[PDB]
Design a protein around this ligand. Sequence first.
Ligand SMILES: *[C@@H]1O[C@H](CO)[C@@H](O[C@@H]2O[C@H](CO)[C@@H](O[C@@H]3O[C@H](CO[C@H]4O[C@H](CO)[C@@H](O)[C@H](O[C@H]5O[C@H](CO)[C@@H](O)[C@H](O)[C@@H]5O[C@H]5O[C@H](CO)[C@@H](O)[C@H](O)[C@@H]5O)[C@@H]4O)[C@@H](O)[C@H](O[C@H]4O[C@H](CO)[C@@H](O)[C@H](O)[C@@H]4O[C@H]4O[C@H](CO)[C@@H](O)[C@H](O)[C@@H]4O)[C@@H]3O)[C@H](O)[C@H]2NC(C)=O)[C@H](O)[C@H]1NC(C)=O
Ligand SMILES: CC(C)(C)c1cc(S(C)(=O)=O)cc(-c2ccc(Cl)cc2)n1
Ligand SMILES: [Ca+2]
Ligand SMILES: [Cl-]
Ligand code: NA
Ligand code: NA
Ligand SMILES: [Zn+2]
Length: 806
Amino acid sequence: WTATSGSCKGRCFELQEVGPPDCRCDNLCKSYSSCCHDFDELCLKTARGWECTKDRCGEVRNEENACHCSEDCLSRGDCCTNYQVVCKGESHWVDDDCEEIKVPECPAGFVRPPLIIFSVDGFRASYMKKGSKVMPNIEKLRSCGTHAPYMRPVYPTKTFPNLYTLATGLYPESHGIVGNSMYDPVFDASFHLRGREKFNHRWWGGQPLWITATKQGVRAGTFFWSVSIPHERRILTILQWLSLPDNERPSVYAFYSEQPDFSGHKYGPFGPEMTNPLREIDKTVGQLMDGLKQLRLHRCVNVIFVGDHGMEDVTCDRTEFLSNYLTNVDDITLVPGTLGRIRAKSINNSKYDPKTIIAALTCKKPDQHFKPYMKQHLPKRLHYANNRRIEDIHLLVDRRWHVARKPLDVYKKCFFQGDHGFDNKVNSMQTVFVGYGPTFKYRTKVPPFENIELYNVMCDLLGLKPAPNNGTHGSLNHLLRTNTFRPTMPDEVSRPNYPGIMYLQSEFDLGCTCDDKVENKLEELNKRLHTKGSTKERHLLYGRPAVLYRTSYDILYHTDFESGYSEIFLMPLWTSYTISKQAEVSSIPEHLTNCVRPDVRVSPGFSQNCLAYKNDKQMSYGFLFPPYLSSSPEAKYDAFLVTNMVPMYPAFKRVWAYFQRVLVKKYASERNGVNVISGPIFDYNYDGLRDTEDEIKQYVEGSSIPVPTHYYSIITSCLDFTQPADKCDGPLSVSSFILPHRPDNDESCNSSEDESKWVEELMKMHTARVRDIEHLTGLDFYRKTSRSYSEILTLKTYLHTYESEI
Ligand SMILES: *[C@@H]1O[C@H](CO)[C@@H](O[C@@H]2O[C@H](CO)[C@@H](O[C@@H]3O[C@H](CO[C@H]4O[C@H](CO)[C@@H](O)[C@H](O[C@H]5O[C@H](CO)[C@@H](O)[C@H](O)[C@@H]5O[C@H]5O[C@H](CO)[C@@H](O)[C@H](O)[C@@H]5O)[C@@H]4O)[C@@H](O)[C@H](O[C@H]4O[C@H](CO)[C@@H](O)[C@H](O)[C@@H]4O[C@H]4O[C@H](CO)[C@@H](O)[C@H](O)[C@@H]4O)[C@@H]3O)[C@H](O)[C@H]2NC(C)=O)[C@H](O)[C@H]1NC(C)=O
Ligand SMILES: CC(C)(C)c1cc(S(C)(=O)=O)cc(-c2ccc(Cl)cc2)n1
Ligand SMILES: [Ca+2]
Ligand SMILES: [Cl-]
Ligand code: NA
Ligand code: NA
Ligand SMILES: [Zn+2]
């Protein structure tokens, strides 16, 4: 019930929302069907439109008008935004030359530069260049401020998950808005874009910027806008709030545009119909900036112009139907479109089986345009699993396509030409970032970054402590003139043991054999030196990784590689090695094919054993430092130590062996040497964070050897590739992966072919940030470089995407 008989007199766009049944006059009252009876009359005036004209100048105030052109309008804070241009001979902001804003130039009584976030739905990154001729205001913000060539959204690349990620710095799996449509099985409730369930607070996790601000005594404008409020009124409302007395005036504001997404869905991302929506958005930006200029705030406020996601060409005919694959299509519920999510239609159906659904959807048609995954097997960079609102079965849909359950869903539930939602590395889904104002840099281009980083920066711009989030605070310090956040490296928690030779060969009963009893004061001192760390500067180039949790581990040195060996997990946490451009690949010699060697520095009780692998008919083994890249026949023996061995399914060994034998050398050739750190990952509860020992679900049969769910590598070289990786004077360059450790290659439909035709494709799909590996391992990398820590934070957030140029 709403008692709509109250009034909006002196309450239009009030900031504190009133509770039912009292009627509302706020930004969202229309969305709740709750506005007072006179809200339209008083708060949505339209008379005489939005622009001053010559004959209106100095008019007698008429309170009915949508905006004013009378002499008193500046003191009232309600002139039309072009008032000074039309009536007082001023220029439009867009016509003024750009001039650096070295310090805030703010009116008396301003405690901090306000922040205005201007968000645009469906604003594909390439519109900044492609549309630049029709967007002069936006192009000025872009060229004069700080801009990225594109900003990466979160998956899925849908509006509500991305707006709420912008607000919170959280992945959707953590903030809980994992789609525009959701079912939560604990609430037994459904969330939809249409209707009332979405306003319930139980869906919205984390702490969004407006709450962070309010809790710390910084007043916020209402961020949300009912779709029917025209954009001109939204801007005039912001501008009126900026005229409030100091004690009443917000310091942070948001505008949102439903364009260009609205037209993009109808016309495609580059339909000829798209130029007009881009012009209209640019006109709105001009209204804001002219309005700020009238208020003498245009060199005071920080403005962020930011998008939620891009837009791709998608038409009805490019739809895959689950009814062409499944016998049981009526026993499943599908959340359809540019991603698929499947669960049982009925929890009482005991014949429902996810394994048979996945198999029926796997590599069934030659050009199949989606791929099924259990959610824990999705690329870890998506961070899309740890939430009960995310169904166990996920379909990753190829760009330009849709998946649906049955054909009747697509013609009885063809008009549209654009959509979005795909994998967040796809070029068409990239969106925009420009920052302009005293706190941002002047005429500065920054590399692409992820939208999870922006909450921390918005907190920095407002002097707020951010709530715990998934950004890496300091990684965006290079966007800022001032207000940088200068963190300190985390403290190492566990220090390593440095074991020497402490065990005789006969103390070991591991079931291993090696033909290494084939046998000098000159060369023996030399090899003792290698076991002591004499080559460690060549192979550990950025310092030892720090271990950020409590554990027992040993540093083990070798001619060609260094490792941190866990006594608890019985394998290395990390293995580090450098491969120069001139490095030679060799074979594993015949007599060494089955060689595994006890490590006399590590007790039998803390070692793996070969007998467990013999007995486990599903499990084989690989090595973390590859025997193929040994520096010499004698050094190669080190690579067969039991302390370099890790459990690997034979299907996975196909992948790993190709990476090690072929790809490492290729990268060294292409990058002028590489440094490689590789290791296992254990994430059995798919929360993106290192498992403790009691979370491990699988072991090598009969043993305490834990099976990794993933294997990583971090491949680092000199950004200036004219210098070798091991003699690099300046910035670094990195690419990483987190490969799923699976007992089949069903993910790769072409895996019956030679590894040259499918393995690198798999590795690209599973590209990762160093930061993703840090979460998953509790390790902290790049501890010892000569680079600034914020520079290293940016490096750690880099994602190598393998998409061609935007
Ligand atoms: C991205 O950044 C975020 C933010 O930093 C990281 O997320 C944090 O991760 C922590 C570890 O997973 C987690 O810490 C836990 O918090 C529990 C208390 O949680 C509540 O309070 C906080 C603070 O206000 C709040 O934010 C939480 O909000 C979550 O839950 C509600 C309701 O479901 C949602 O609306 C909201 O969206 C959010 O959900 C998300 O996180 C939860 C986990 O909390 C997931 O389940 C959801 O899927 C979703 O992803 C909560 O309201 C606390 O109780 C936990 O403590 C247990 O474990 C510790 C181990 O240290 C142990 O000492 C305790 O005894 C305790 O164990 C007991 O409970 C167990 C489980 O029932 C049981 O098995 C035991 O036997 C014991 O009884 C724990 O400290 C923190 O909450 C989240 N925060 C957020 C916002 O998500 C995220 O990790 C980052 N991602 C990456 C990849 O780095
Ligand atoms: C997704 C929610 C409902 C929380 C939402 C709605 C709207 S709306 C379309 O304008 O109602 C705007 C924003 C918003 C979030 C973050 C940022 Cl930085 C700016 C704006 N968020
Ligand atoms: Ca985990
Ligand atoms: Cl043995
Ligand atoms: Na085996
Ligand atoms: Na396959
Ligand atoms: Zn859309």
